[PDB]
Structures are given as structure tokens and as C-alpha cells.
Amino acid sequence: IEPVDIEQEMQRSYIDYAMSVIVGRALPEVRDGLKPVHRRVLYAMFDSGFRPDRSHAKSARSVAETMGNYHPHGDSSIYDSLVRMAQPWSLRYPLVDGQGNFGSPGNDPPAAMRYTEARLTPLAMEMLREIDEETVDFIPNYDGRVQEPTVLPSRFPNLLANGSGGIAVGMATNIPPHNLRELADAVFWALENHDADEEETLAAVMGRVKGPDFPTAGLIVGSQGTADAYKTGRGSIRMRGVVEVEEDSRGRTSLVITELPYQVNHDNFITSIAEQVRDGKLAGISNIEDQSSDRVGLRIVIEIKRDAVAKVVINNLYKHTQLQTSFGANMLAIVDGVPRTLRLDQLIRYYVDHQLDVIVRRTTYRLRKANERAHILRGLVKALDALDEVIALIRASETVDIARAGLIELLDIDEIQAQAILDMQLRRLAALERQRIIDDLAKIEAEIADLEDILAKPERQRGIVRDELAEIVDRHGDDRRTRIIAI
Amino acid sequence: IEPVDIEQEMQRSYIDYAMSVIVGRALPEVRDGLKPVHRRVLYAMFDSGFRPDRSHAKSARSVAETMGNYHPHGDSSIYDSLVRMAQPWSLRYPLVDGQGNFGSPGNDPPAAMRYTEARLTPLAMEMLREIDEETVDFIPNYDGRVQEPTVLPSRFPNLLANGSGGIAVGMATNIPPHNLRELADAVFWALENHDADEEETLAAVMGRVKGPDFPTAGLIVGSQGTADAYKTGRGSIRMRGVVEVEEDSRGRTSLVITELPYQVNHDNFITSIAEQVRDGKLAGISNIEDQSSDRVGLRIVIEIKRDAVAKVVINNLYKHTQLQTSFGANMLAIVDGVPRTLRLDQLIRYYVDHQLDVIVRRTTYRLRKANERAHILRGLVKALDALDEVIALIRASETVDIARAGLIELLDIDEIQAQAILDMQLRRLAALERQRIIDDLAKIEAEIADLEDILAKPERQRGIVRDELAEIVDRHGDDRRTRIIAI
Amino acid sequence: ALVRRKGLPGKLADCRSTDPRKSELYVVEGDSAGGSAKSGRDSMFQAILPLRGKIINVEKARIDRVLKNTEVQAIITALGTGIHDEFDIGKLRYHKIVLMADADVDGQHISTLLLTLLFRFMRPLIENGHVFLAQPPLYKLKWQRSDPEFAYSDRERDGLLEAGLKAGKKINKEDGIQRYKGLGEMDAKELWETTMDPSVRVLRQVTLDDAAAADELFSILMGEDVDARRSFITRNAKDVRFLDV
Amino acid sequence: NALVRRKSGLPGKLADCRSTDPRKSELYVVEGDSAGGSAKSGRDSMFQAILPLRGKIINVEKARIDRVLKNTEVQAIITALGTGIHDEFDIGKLRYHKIVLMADADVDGQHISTLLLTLLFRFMRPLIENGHVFLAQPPLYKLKWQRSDPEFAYSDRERDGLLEAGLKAGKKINKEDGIQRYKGLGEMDAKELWETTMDPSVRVLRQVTLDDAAAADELFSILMGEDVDARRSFITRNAKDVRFLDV
DNA sequence: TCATGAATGACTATGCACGT
DNA sequence: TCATGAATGACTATGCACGT
Numbered sequence A, B: 001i002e003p004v005d006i007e008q009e010m011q012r013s014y015i016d017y018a019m020s021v022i023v024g025r026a027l028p029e030v031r032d033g034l035k036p037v038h039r040r041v042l043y044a045m046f047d048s049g050f051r052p053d054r055s056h057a058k059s060a061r062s063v064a065e066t067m068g069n070y071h072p073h074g075d076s077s078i079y080d081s082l083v084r085m086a087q088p089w090s091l092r093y094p095l096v097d098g099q100g101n102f103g104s105p106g107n108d109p110p111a112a113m114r115y116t117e118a119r120l121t122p123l124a125m126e127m128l129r130e131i132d133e134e135t136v137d138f139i140p141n142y143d144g145r146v147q148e149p150t151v152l153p154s155r156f157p158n159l160l161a162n163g164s165g166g167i168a169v170g171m172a173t174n175i176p177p178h179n180l181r182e183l184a185d186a187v188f189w190a191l192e193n194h195d196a197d198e199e200e201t202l203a204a205v206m207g208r209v210k211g212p213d214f215p216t217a218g219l220i221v222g223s224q225g226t227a228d229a230y231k232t233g234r235g236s237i238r239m240r241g242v243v244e245v246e247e248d249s250r251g252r253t254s255l256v257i258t259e260l261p262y263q264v265n266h267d268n269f270i271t272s273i274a275e276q277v278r279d280g281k282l283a284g285i286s287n288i289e290d291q292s293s294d295r296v297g298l299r300i301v302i303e304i305k306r307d308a309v310a311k312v313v314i315n316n317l318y319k320h321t322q323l324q325t326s327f328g329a330n331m332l333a334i335v336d337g338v339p340r341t342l343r344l345d346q347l348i349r350y351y352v353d354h355q356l357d358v359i360v361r362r363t364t365y366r367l368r369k370a371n372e373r374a375h376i377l378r379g380l381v382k383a384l385d386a387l388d389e390v391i392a393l394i395r396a397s398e399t400v401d402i403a404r405a406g407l408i409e410l411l412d413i414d415e416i417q418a419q420a421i422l423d424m425q426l427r428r429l430a431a432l433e434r435q436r437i438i439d440d441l442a443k444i445e446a447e448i449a450d451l452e453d454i455l456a457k458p459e460r461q462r463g464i465v466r467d468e469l470a471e472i473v474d475r476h477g478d479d480r481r482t483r484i485i486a487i
Numbered sequence C: 001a002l003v004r005r006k007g008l009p010g011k012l013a014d015c016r017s018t019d020p021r022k023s024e025l026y027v028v029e030g031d032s033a034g035g036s037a038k039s040g041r042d043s044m045f046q047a048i049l050p051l052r053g054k055i056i057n058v059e060k061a062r063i064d065r066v067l068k069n070t071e072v073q074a075i076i077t078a079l080g081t082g083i084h085d086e087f088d089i090g091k092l093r094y095h096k097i098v099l100m101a102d103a104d105v106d107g108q109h110i111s112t113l114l115l116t117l118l119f120r121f122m123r124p125l126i127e128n129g130h131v132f133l134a135q136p137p138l139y140k141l142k143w144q145r146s147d148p149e150f151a152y153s154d155r156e157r158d159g160l161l162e163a164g165l166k167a168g169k170k171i172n173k174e175d176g177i178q179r180y181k182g183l184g185e186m187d188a189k190e191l192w193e194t195t196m197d198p199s200v201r202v203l204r205q206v207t208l209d210d211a212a213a214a215d216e217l218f219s220i221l222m223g224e225d226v227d228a229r230r231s232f233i234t235r236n237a238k239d240v241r242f243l244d245v
Numbered sequence D: 001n002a003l004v005r006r007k008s009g010l011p012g013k014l015a016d017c018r019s020t021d022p023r024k025s026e027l028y029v030v031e032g033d034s035a036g037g038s039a040k041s042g043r044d045s046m047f048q049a050i051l052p053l054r055g056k057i058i059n060v061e062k063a064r065i066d067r068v069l070k071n072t073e074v075q076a077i078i079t080a081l082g083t084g085i086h087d088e089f090d091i092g093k094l095r096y097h098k099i100v101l102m103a104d105a106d107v108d109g110q111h112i113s114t115l116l117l118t119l120l121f122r123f124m125r126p127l128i129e130n131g132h133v134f135l136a137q138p139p140l141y142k143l144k145w146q147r148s149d150p151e152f153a154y155s156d157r158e159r160d161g162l163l164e165a166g167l168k169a170g171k172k173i174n175k176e177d178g179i180q181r182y183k184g185l186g187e188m189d190a191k192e193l194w195e196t197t198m199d200p201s202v203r204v205l206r207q208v209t210l211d212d213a214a215a216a217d218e219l220f221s222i223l224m225g226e227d228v229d230a231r232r233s234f235i236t237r238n239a240k241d242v243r244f245l246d247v
Numbered sequence E, F: 001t002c003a004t005g006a007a008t009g010a011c012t013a014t015g016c017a018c019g020t
């Protein structure tokens, strides 16, 4: 029996927990804004073909595939993570297209795994766009049987778009979601002004990103908190719901709440005001009635007494309920395996850097693949010019190994190219088919020259990020939901 | 709003439930001895490639695949069904190779889905043998997306081997498991004596199937109950555990129970004797100690008082505990979509019929494919005999269609053969490869001759069942476990 | 008029209308379905009571054991009426009791277990036509450009498909016709536009003609006598298709 | 000294042993019901008892004492150990002279260990001082040779070593089934748990030692206490050098 | 003291037939 | 009354950091 000191054990074990939680559970990678469970679910669904071009697969299959290949944890909590990515009130831009009962903004829980179906959304398809072209580093999974992506291509700024909230050890993150169109403008500026310093970049990006854009709409009151978050990485953003005063036929007034701030449970909100009225906290209120439905959305009617002022009751609601509540912004994300609190210019810059990396790597992959195709095509063209000989040789060969070795010697060709000649079908010996091989060579060499040109010009590389992102925003960008007002 | 009478509604709804439960849930198909969920789990795993030639897949993947394509029900109860099929104390011949904690004969529950892995067993691979050769009818699944098998080939008599117990509506089944080697002998006789009447067949099969062979070993007392079950389809078979009296060093006798009858919970058994002694109903017992372990198996030590006779205490245990308990046999299975109580000669005969159907269908499929392959080969040989010409025509063609149409004219060929010539690689124009094509034609024509002979001679068909089953028994057959004694 | 909860079952999502004559109780199979129903309902007049698992057979089970069943107590408490001799229609909190179960056989089974509870404990609810059966959809045709159509049978599916194609509409052969295998697979919107919207929902009102004949059939199908039930099924299952011909 | 074991006033989850001598008795505190289940089967029921713990244990450093005593998992530990807590602690009533903590090799197992060690150090310190607390080291790999007996490895290094030696010895492994990798105790069966963690002739135990009580008191308070900042600065300061604690 | 969310599943009740 | 075995998921408690 080996002896071990409790201090050595406690320190080693707790740090091991803290670090993996920090880097590998609770906090988002800055480049794609994803935690490991998110990234692994999406890749599992992607690899399984659960894409928008096919009908929703049973969500149990997505969970099981994630479990069996990438995420060595429980099916229960994995389903919860998948479910979240499909809720329009949780994600500003949902990554999972859910079919069935995925719960509500209230206490109505989502249906069980067995009852729901799911697939990737079109925007999630942009997260994974060209992942198969060596655009991101892959590492072996938890048992080395298969490969998993270290990060996704993320062809739209997902961290800022959908935001992130996570509790780690010694620290926690809380990034709000943003409007895709505003983020795109910030990226477009960062691309054009690629030499601008942090001082200028922050000023530019802050002018284009006017503030967080919550899926639950609502209001943002003030501008200080927003500015703090972007300049410090920390800030308290004041949120509000939307209240519209209605009058009655008798002459009674009632307050109608149609929106609530981000991450406010609708049922807990109604329960809170009810408990604050019975005990005696919000006088002036006469009746609380939830007239909400699937067709009118949120609609909480607060009938007030005849001796009550509408704004007084509304101000009391702001004070004593989450009708007005603050978002504690803390811009914490993993950068190169290290947790770091970031300014808004850093969040954009780091993302832009990732996009340039993705496209240079894609170009390199395509350029390598093009040369291989060109290489084999050159071998075929040599065979066609001496076709009368090539056939005679293969025929006169006792084996295919003798036939191969002969092809190398005659036409001065590689063994890979020589193999391709052997693998050639009798179809490709037709007149027009011989011509297709010729033209295809000319086609690729033009393509190779183009690809080489991209790698040699940083201008084009930035241009591709811009142009490709622009298409995504034009297709999947939407209006702002959260309205920004002053004090 | 349409009116409906309560009698009309009650009758239609309850019968619809009863019938589906009877035919499509609770009772086994006579041909493969499987209920729908069993058949669907096994085919899901099979189609997913979860076979003994690969490492155990996470059991969640098997459930999800079963759930998502074939079995429109809950993940929880499907896992329980998969698990049971992996327990050596439940199935006489397990169909699932389980890796992890799949529970115990006692109250220790199986591990959760997330913790266990699973794959098909070699014997389960015989259940599915050549299922892809049109050996069984396939129907559309629950949403028409994919096809599922109505029944499995079942190349060993699984119903009798593994038995079946099920509660339906208006009826229930309870077929005990049997020794595979004994079942095979019965099948071998049924094949040889294929014209024998039911009177002779029942006598023959009853002599070879000596009785049930339980996975939990134990004893069978008497022969009447077994005989009743085989001749009537109903019978009460008396089971017993194994008790060994040991004499302590300090003049102390103790009963050691090392085996229990089928489906007796080890923990409930110990609890029963403990509760029947802490009051006054099993006097003579002094102490109860469970010395069981993973290494010695079951070992329940019952120390008895000195003024107590061992045989008296054992008889008292037989009477007041499940150390002696009866198996209520009720040989009920679905035959052609109809529930039927069957004699042992009927159970064998119906299985033999299924095997003959499987092999005739297999032969037909192979003969059709052989004719297709031979058909194309005939085209290739014609191309080789006029090879110098074949090349010239394809060259002068503007399209491949001009080249094809010419091949038909040259060699008098179908469109299928000519296309096969077109798809031919230069690989095969080597000397040995040209000869390989020739010999391959001769091989198939030899196979077609063989296959045609199978279809024309029922003798060979019966011979294939015998020889193929014989291989299965020699490999996967084991010793008897349940010992049969007299009164 | 009677008070709604805002002393009743915890599972009950009561309505807002305090008039039983205007109120409806949807007894739903499953928590998932009941959850989405609670969202897609008309909260003014429609209440939801989700039932979990197979209902206890009141024909077989002893009376005291039935009263201990949480799911039965939920029904009895929510309906407000008593049971047996202590039954009082005057306290009926909902004049429309809609049983909503899956189209599958287990839904059919649960229906018979509920109808058995009602017929044995609260028969007047059936006699006075307060009991209804919602017919869920089986298919959802998702046209590429046109509004989606719901079908309640294989026949209607084939018909609506034929008409649409003839009209020049088109469907994806991937997404295509979504087939419902239960209420749990539906969302709030779908349940409203097929089972809860009073202007399109297909309800069936349970009528009771011959009380004596019904009394016997309940005892045969739901009673403890298996033999009687075994022979009844083998006798009548052959002709279930031809009950309405 | 001898004490009665449960057989048809102790925790319901406890699978007690048969031996009435604490000096010869052992309590395996196991992570997870699945693992505890297999442990209950593969154990030596004569001397080894199993107490499965479910979920992350409550932090006694952060939580108030009254809340800790209401926690079902803590009550199970305290009740099973038989000793009191704090001032009413009595080693004489200790029902097991070997308290083996058995958690997954993964990061979450390490966390549970620190939560258990915190419970012990704060409520029942003498158990640590007197060497009654141990840490079982589970296997990470199982090498399944085609013809030879399977070997267990407790590290990536040992895996590579046993693989090299066996291949050098002329043995062979399937490249499919091959080396089974354990991701937790729940994936193991009864036999495997016996032949790697519970068999006293093969098990790899580590006895928790307590040298500097004052230094330990501080480290527990920093890592497990309510002060986040103190914990944050400690991690950022010392995490960089965790690899080099034993070099 | 409650919410967040990614981590560490056992327990609870019925239908159905049949034998104790 | 209990076991059988396929059928019809919600509830329950902690860690972790932070703000009302």
C-alpha cells in the first residue's frame, strides 16, 4: 500500500477538476462560441446526416450517436443540451430544428426523448460548412476509435450571436446574444480595416453593435452597462418587458404585459406578483389573469384599482419583479485553451482570425486535392497519346503487376498515375470521352492557378470571408427584437 | 359532432387492443420464437453492424436504432428487453452479448443504458443468417420509411431452445427452454421421417427432447408434467434446486443450496426463508448465511439445530419456499397470425417447415443472381473473343451510346451486357484476368447446375437443413444443465 | 358558477371561465401531450387533466384500492361530482368531458378504462351526453407552397393527396407526409388546429342506449372472468370491421 | 470489540459485510449505483461492505451544518461509519478499520474524492490521522489477448508497456475488440471490479496521510471554502505546475 | 435564497393471465 | 398478494459563480 498525503491529493484532484471544467465543460471556445457538449451534438447530427435536406430524425438517435462516439456522459443531460439548442426563447439563432414538444418559456417541461424529433438548422449547417476540407483540427475521441473536431468552422459569429452562460470553477461566463446583421457589419469593418489598432477597432465595432439582441425581445434601458461590457468585459445591462395600458368599457384600466426580459420564467413571474399581492406588496392591482395562448403569445393582464395610477403600478412592478431585471454581462471565453475576459474588439478580431484560418486551410486543402487530380489526369493524357501501345502492353502482360511495371517504363509515369490507367474504364476510350480528360486537365490547371492566387493574396482571403458571410446574413439574418431606449 | 354508442366503442376498441397485444406484442411467432420487440432489436443491431466481428457498441445506440426505425415506443422498456436477452440466467441461449453490469438473478438491477455496451451473439447471428437473400418476407415499418422483417430465418429452433413467457389478453404463454442438442435430434428425425404422421412424430420427438433445460440448472422431479405439456400443450413441471448437506467440525449440520429453480429470485428466496423463521414456521433452522460470490456462484448456507433432521428441514423448505416450485407450461404461440396451443410435434414440424421455406427461398434468390451474373459474363466472353474489334468501335463513337449500340450489333448483345462491357476496366485485359473471366463463367454455370438441382429435389433441401443445423449445434451446442430424476 | 384554481389536483390545468356550462375538461393521455395541450388550449373555456400510465380497472380492482389511485382521485376531484350513490351532477365542473388518447391500441385501451370508470362510478355523465372522444390526426400533409392539411385516416390521406396533386400542388418526398404515432409527438399548434379548436375538432359524443346490455359488455370485457372474455374475443374479433357496415 | 451487521438501523443502500470484527472489516464507498451494484456482487461479502453514493456529495465546507446533516448521502456515510462527528466522535465505535473511497478515474471521480475527503477531514478527522482512509485506483484499460489471460492497466504508460511486452512475447490481440478502455466504474462488471480494486491480493490502494494539519486546514478552506477569489488565484497559480508535484 | 446549465439515475403505478 | 414481461416519464439533490 502506497502512502499519499492529503494535501497532495486534494490539490492535484481539485485542480484537475477545475481545469477540465473551465476549458472542457462550462465555458465556450471563442472561435465558435460552443461548449464541448454543443460541438459534439452538432457534429454527431451532422455526421449522421440529420440535416435540413432530410426529415427530422428521432432525437434519441442524435443523443445516442453523441454518447457512443464523442461525449462519454449521460443520455439524460445530453438530451437537455440538445433541447436547449432548439428553443427559440433560449437561442437567438437556434442550431437545432426541433419537431415536437420542446417545452415553453414557463415551467412546462420539454417532452421526453422518445417523443421528439430533431435535425440541424440551416444556420447550424454554416457552423459545419466545409468541415470535411481540413478547415479545422481534428483529434481522436475518448477511446481513439474515431476523430472529432476540436472546433467548428463557424461561418457566422456564433459566440456573439447566440451568447453563452456557464458556471465553471473559480469563474463563470455570461455573454448575451446579439443581432447577426449588426455583428456582420462589425466583421466587415474588421476585415476592411485589418490594420486598425485596438483603440480604433473598439470604437468602430461598438458603433455597429448597438447592444445585445435577446430572443425574448423586450427593452434595454440605458447605454452605460452595454458600453461597460464592451470596454471592460463586464457590465450590468438593464432589461425591461413591454407594458401596454388598456382601458375598459366601464372605465377600468388594466396593464397588458406582452414581453419579458431575457431568461425570465413566465410562470415564476406570474407566481411572484401573485405572492406579492396577497401578502401585501403591490397594492393598486385588482386582478391577475394570464390570457396567453399559442396564437397571441405572452399576454398577462393586470387589472388595477380605480384609485391607482398606471405608471405607479408599472414602476412598482419594475422594482419588485423581473419585469425589470439586469443582465450581468461577463465576457469570458476560452482563447487558445486559456480562459480570458475579452473586449468586444477582441471577440470580433479573434473570430475574424478564425475565419481567415478556415479559408486559408480550405484553399490549401483544395489546392492539394487539385494537384492530385491534375497529376493523375496528366498520366491519362500520356496514355491517350500512345493509346495504341498502352492497350497492347496490358494485353501482352501475363499479370496486372507486369502490366503496371511496363506502363511506368514506357510513358515515364508514376505508379499512382500508372494505376489510374489500369483503373480506366473502356468508356473513357470513346472519342468525346478522350476529349473530356483533356478539357478536365485544362479545367483544373485553371482552378489550381486560382487557388494559388488566393493563398498569395491576403486581400482575396479577406474578400472571401466578407462575400461568404454576406450571403449567410442576407439569407439567415433577421430584424432586431430587443428595442434600445435611453434613460 | 357525431354520436357513438358506448357498446360500439367499447367492443371495437378493446378487441383492437386485445388482438394487437395477442398477435403483435405479448406472444411469440412460432417460426422464430420471437416477439416483435425482440425481432426488431436484433435486426436493428444487425443492420447497424453490431456483430461479433466488431467491438461492443454502446447499448444506447441499439435502442435508438430500434426505436427510430422499427419499434415506435419508449427507450426505457426497449432497453429492458435488450438487457434480458443478454442475461445468462434468463435466456438458455443468450442472443445479446452484453458488456457491463446487466444485473443479477437477485434484486441487483441492471446498469443504466449509458453504462452498458452490447452486440449480437454468434447464435443470434444464426437467427439472422442470410436474411439479406430474400429468405423472409419484409414489410414497411411504422412510417413506411424503411423495411423490416416479418420473421427471422432462425437457423436454430429458438422458440423451444430459449422458450417464451408472455401475458396477453384473454390468454398467456409460458414455454420453457430446452437443450439445443436434444432439439436438433428431434429436428433431424422430423427431416428423415418427413412423411410420418402426428402419432408417430410425437412419440419420436418426445423420446429425444427429454424435457426442459433451464439456464439456472436445478432439477426436474417426475415425468408426468413434462409429458402433459408435450401432448396437451399444458402441463405442470416440478422443479427443484440442489441441496448438499455438510457436517461442520463442531457437530453441526448445514444445508448448502447451490442451485435454484427457473425464475426464482435469489434475494427473495433468502428473504422468504428468513421471514418464515423469525416467527415459527421453519423450525430446525438455526442460522441463514449467504456465502455467495462472483467466484463460487450461488451458495446459501442453512445451519440447522442439532435436534433437527436434515431431510425434514429440506422437505419443509420444499413445501414452504420456492426451493421446490412448479413451472406452469402453456405452449402458446402465434401460428400464421393466429394464437395456438401446440403439441411438441407441431412445434418441431412448424419450425422444420420454416427452415425448408428459408432454404428454398435462399436457393431461388441465389439462382436468380447466378443467372444475372452468368448473363453478364456471357457478354464479357464474347468481348474477349473479338477483343480487337471491341476496342475499335468504342473509339469512333461520339458518345458512349453510339459505342454501346455498336456492341449489340457486333456481338449480338443485350443492353445489360453491353453496359457491363463498357464499365469494364483495363485492369481485366491482362492475360490472367482474361482467363479469370472465362473460369468465372464456368464456375457460375457449375453453381447454377447445383442450385437447379436443389430446387428439383426435396431430398437435398432437407439435407441442407440437417447439415447446416448440424454445424450450428456442433459449434454452439452445450451440455444439459437441468438434471431429470424420477419420483 | 364554480371557482377555478389560480383544493384541486396538482396536475389539473384549470380553465378561467367559472361557468361549467361553458367549460370543457380535456382528459389527456401522457404528460407530454397534456403539456402541449395546456399551451395550445383556449385557457378561457378549456382545462387539461393529464393522466399518466394505464388507468386502474375499476371492474377488477376492489373499491378501496381504486380510491387510493392517484389518477382516479384526480378525475373524481376535478369533475366535482361524487361517485355511485353520492353522485351529484349539480356539482359537475365541466359540461364537456373530452377523452383524448393516442390513435394507437394503448390509447384505445386507456379509453375503455376511462369509459369503465365513468360508466361504473359516474354513469349520469354518459347518459346526459357530457362525455366525448376527441379524434386525433394521423397524418400531416406539408405542401411546398400551400398550407398544411391534416388527415384523420388512411383514406383521407389518399384523398387529400390526390386532390392536391390534381390541383397542381407539390410535396417533398423527404419531409412529405408527417405521420403521427401519438399525441406526444404533436406540438401546441398542431393539437389546437386538430383536436381543441372548436371550429375544426372532431369530437364523438358517447351515447348510452341499452343500459342492461352495456352493463353486461363492461363486465365481460373488463371483469375478472377471463374465459368469458377469451370466448367473446374469439367470437367477435372476427367481425369488428363490420360493426358499422 | 464487535458490532452487529444488518441482516433482514443502518442505511438502506448499505450492503454490509458478515464479519463482526471492525479490524478485519472494510467499507467501500462507491461512486454510482451501477458501480456499487457490481461491487456488491464481486466483493468478498465476509469482510467487504459497499455503500453506493449517488451524485456529487454536498460540500460541508460551504453548506451550513444543519443542511449537511439533512443530506441523505452524508447521513448514510456517518451512520455506516458508526463514529460520531466533531466533538462526539469516537473511534471505538468505528465499524470499519478500512474506508476505501472508490470513484471513477475521470475528472468527476476526482471531484467526489475531494468532497468526501473534505467531509472526513472536517467531521471525522481522526479517521485520516489513524490511516483508516484509502483510495482505490481503478483500471483504465483491459488488454484482451487472443489466447492469453487478459491484463489490466492503470495508466497509459502501463498499457503501452504490457502491450509491447506481450507482442514481444509472441502474444496477439484483435485490433477490433482489442484494448477495452474504462471510462468509469459503472462500465465494469462484478468480476473486473474484484480483480482490480477489491481483491486484497491485487488491489492498488493509497492510504491517505495527514502531515501538516494546519497546512491542510488552509488548503481545504481555500479549495472548498466560500471565498471564490482565493480559490481562483490558487488555481491560476498552481495549476501550471500540477504535472511537476512528484518529479 | 433562487435562477442559471453542464456534470454526478433510482423509484414510483397501472393492464394483462396464471399459479402459488 | 407476488412473480413474470412488454406496454403506458416526472421527480428527486448536490457542485459551481453571481446578482438580486
Ligand SMILES: O=C(O)c1cn(C2CC2)c2cc(N3CCNCC3)c(F)cc2c1=O
Residues within 6 Å of the ligand: B074, B075, B076, B077, C052, C053, C054, E012, E013, F008, F009
Ligand atoms: O417507460 C417506462 O418504463 C415507464 C413509463 N411511465 C409512463 C406512463 C408512461 C411510467 C409511469 C409510472 N407512474 C405511473 C403513474 N403513477 C406514478 C408512476 C411509473 F411508476 C413507471 C413508468 C415507467 O417505467
Ligand SMILES: O=C(O)c1cn(C2CC2)c2cc(N3CCNCC3)c(F)cc2c1=O
Residues within 6 Å of the ligand: A074, A075, A076, A077, D054, D055, D056, E008, E009, F012, F013
Ligand atoms: O442524468 C441525469 O440527468 C441525472 C443523474 N443522477 C445521478 C447521480 C447520477 C441524478 C441523481 C439525483 N439524486 C441525487 C441523490 N439524491 C436523490 C436524487 C437526481 F435528483 C437527479 C439526477 C439526474 O437528473
Ligand SMILES: [Mg+2]
Residues within 6 Å of the ligand: A076, A077
Ligand atoms: Mg437531469
Ligand SMILES: [Mg+2]
Residues within 6 Å of the ligand: B076, B077
Ligand atoms: Mg419502466
Ligand SMILES: [Mg+2]
Residues within 6 Å of the ligand: C102, C104, C106, C107, C181, C182
Ligand atoms: Mg401511444
Ligand SMILES: [Mg+2]
Residues within 6 Å of the ligand: D104, D106, D108, D109, D183, D184
Ligand atoms: Mg464518471
